[PDB]
């Protein structure tokens with residue numbers, strides 16, 4: 001049986017590919033001459049898959065879609081305090097207003113706009129890194145997330161460097177307020193070379209997937225970025241990535257994304273998918289036309305959105321079974337706050353230790369324990385209450401099926417186990433991969 | 439034993455409660471004279487719990503925290519087109535600029551600002567509804583999600599209606615541009631009563647949990663709002679709810695919220711928790727001081743954020759076992775795209791096809807990706823793919839798969855998207871000549 005996701009994408013490409021509105025970026029010939037007859041799309045999933053269709057293996061300069069990764073690098077290289085001192089978090093469009101530096105927060109608005117991107121590149125390796133070191137770094141981060149060594153399309157680089165007055169202008173202005181210490185030419189060149197890095201739809205998908213999973217590379221399970229850095233990045237993309245697109249992106253699409261003038265659109269939906277789309281021609285706001293439209297279709301056809309509540313919740317509890325005086329409680333999945341909250345509910349539900357008259361409806365609902373759990377997604381948390389003959393003397397906490405867990409989850413469960421013992425219950429933790437400590 | 443969360447809240451109340459900066463809303467004497475020494479907090483979970491501490495049961499007027507709910511009611515009653523024609527989605531602070539109305543559509547920026555909230559109330563029931571009908575509707579939507587009949591604190595209403603020149607100004611300007619049809623006084627009076635609805639920290643939490651779950655009441659499991667509407671409301675809260683707070687709320691805290699000048703703060707984190715916080719005094723920007731500081735702490739202490747990836751994913755697959763010619767594939771949790779993708783992955787992973795799968799990537803090009811895909815189990819746990827890998831393990835030397843048992847008993851619910859995908863994956867399995875018997879006791883697969 002062939003996977004149905006790739007067939008949907010191919011069909012989508014064929015459908016939306018029936019037309020090709022707009023025009024390629026004109027600012028440079030190398031991009032304007034670009035063959036417009038191309039259309040590709042790819043999906044990178046946490047499940048290590050890469051569903052694709054169309055011209056998904058064709059390279060193209062990543063342009064500003066590179067902004068979120070160099071941003072991540074900078075945060076990793078210098079820490080939040082150093083980056084936030086030069087780069088703001090204020091949502092904004094590309095148009096430059098000096099008041100953002102002279103007054104307001106006194107720094108470029110955010111890393112998605114050119115002014116911010118310039119400041120970010122300036123920050124890359126360290127306070128005294130060289131021009132080459134910083135570029136190598138920009139090329140490196142995008143390469144590490146992509147999973148392969150990427151290259152700069154110098155033809156494009158030169159082409160753009162000959163017509164970069166605007167970026168030089170922003171760079172010079174930033175220097176004026178201390179945001180840039182090196183020369184305008186040095187930073188603009190780094191930023192331009194950075195935009196010239198070649199990637200394919202698939203590359204972008206994988207790259208976005210790293211952010212989508214919170215810094216974990218979907219193809220190797222290796223943590224590429226601290227979850228805190230990955231969140232900051234996707235947050236900023238959400239606030240300004242599609243700032244000037246039609247309607248209101250977050251409310252309409254809900255898929256954090258960024259478009260490049262070469263036609264590539266990057267998407268990253270936390271906990272679900274990384275998106276890459278390639279379509280040369282741009283709409284009037286400067287985003288890939290079909291690229292944008294493909295994203296809107298993904299959001300609707302698959303009903304994906306940043307605001308949907310697709311969480312582990314009560315499913316963190318695989319099951320709760322009772323054998324005489326001891327109860328077996330098995331956990332599973334990726335346990336964070338929400339997962340841990342459910343576990344504690346299960347523990348407390350084992351009677352080892354609102355007003356029902358005010359809310360009669362709430363009581364008739366909690367009466368059919370399994371039904372309410374089904375309608376809400378409590379997984380197997382309800383089974384605990386079912387377990388609670390004689391008194392429970394032992395509780396085995398099995399974490400074999402738990403993929404991973406954060407300190408918050410570790411802290412909560414640990415505290416949970418402690419209070420169980422404080423009830424006189426013996427608790428033995430079966431943790432083969434020992435992920436509970438620390 | 440005692441649930442640790444409520445005790446965490448209590449500590450937090452005691453801690454943050456050591457000080458009490460800012461001051462009560464000075465615009466009306468009723469709110470300005472309210473006892474400042476009050477601080478409560480509550481969390482309403484999808485599971486159906488209500489953890490709280492402090493003055494979590496003291497009523498207070500919900501004020502602007504009523505905006506996300508009246509907005510939901512309008513969408514339900516009028517439909518997206520009708521509302522979107524009068525209420526924009528553009529993020530903005532409360533400061534009003536007539537320019538926002540000179541646009542081609544002619545509408546205030548969003549439902550979170552007064553101008554928008556006024557436009558919202560005007561839409562509440564229908565084109566011809568009466569004043570009393572709309573007010574009743576506002577009080578209703580809020581009551582339905584709180585789980586009890588709420589009431590308007592008329593003492594507060596009167597006090598504020600005597601000093602509503604600013605909102606009267608917005609209402610008049612909106613009329614000038616055709617956003618409001620009835621008198622400015624009628625609409626402003628409705629919106630002010632709306633703000634006088636009495637709620638407690640617990641009420642806000644439950645109400646917020648309703649949005650957080652996509653429109654499902656955590657205490658009953660009943661759907662109160664279409665998920666498409668719940669999402670629109672939380673999106674809008676995210677964009678403008680805390681527009682003028684210090685830093686950038688979405689990035690720093692990541693908990694879509696809204697504060698009311700009476701001291702109450704609403705929270706709604708998709709799929710995880712509904713938040714209600716109450717602390718009378720406001721900061722310089724006009725939000726509850728401790729209320730806001732409490733949300734920051736909840737965000738940091740519990741590592742809660744709109745951007746974290748707490749998804750079912752591969753866990754949608756409970757397990758995949760095999761007995762000779764048949765495979766038992768059990769699913770679970772709340773399945774939507776995420777889970778369904780993982781399921782299709784498991785079905786496909788069973789090599790029931792005559793052809794060999796297309797990896798999409800070149801093994802010789804990504805040696806690191808191969809080595810990882812080798813220890814299938816390790817890659818799965820490091821990822822969060824649950825049991826999807828057991829499928830490839832089942833495929834892994836003697837005998838073709840003839841039967842696949844797809845059990846959904848452990849599945850809480852599935853959305854049409856996943857319901858469509860799984861149905862298609864099952865059809866393709868049968869197209870391979872594999873017998874598929876779906877054990878679906880609660881019939882959740884059809885439609």
Ligand SMILES: N[C@@H](CCC(=O)O)C(=O)O
Pocket residue numbers: 062063064065114160167192195259260261262
């Ligand atoms: N290299 C372009 C950016 C292209 C884009 O917006 O993606 C510039 O800095 O003007």
Ligand SMILES: N[C@@H](CCC(=O)O)C(=O)O
Pocket residue numbers: 500501502503552605630633697698699700
């Ligand atoms: N009812 C108040 C709004 C309170 C709030 O901002 O939360 C007003 O219109 O002035």
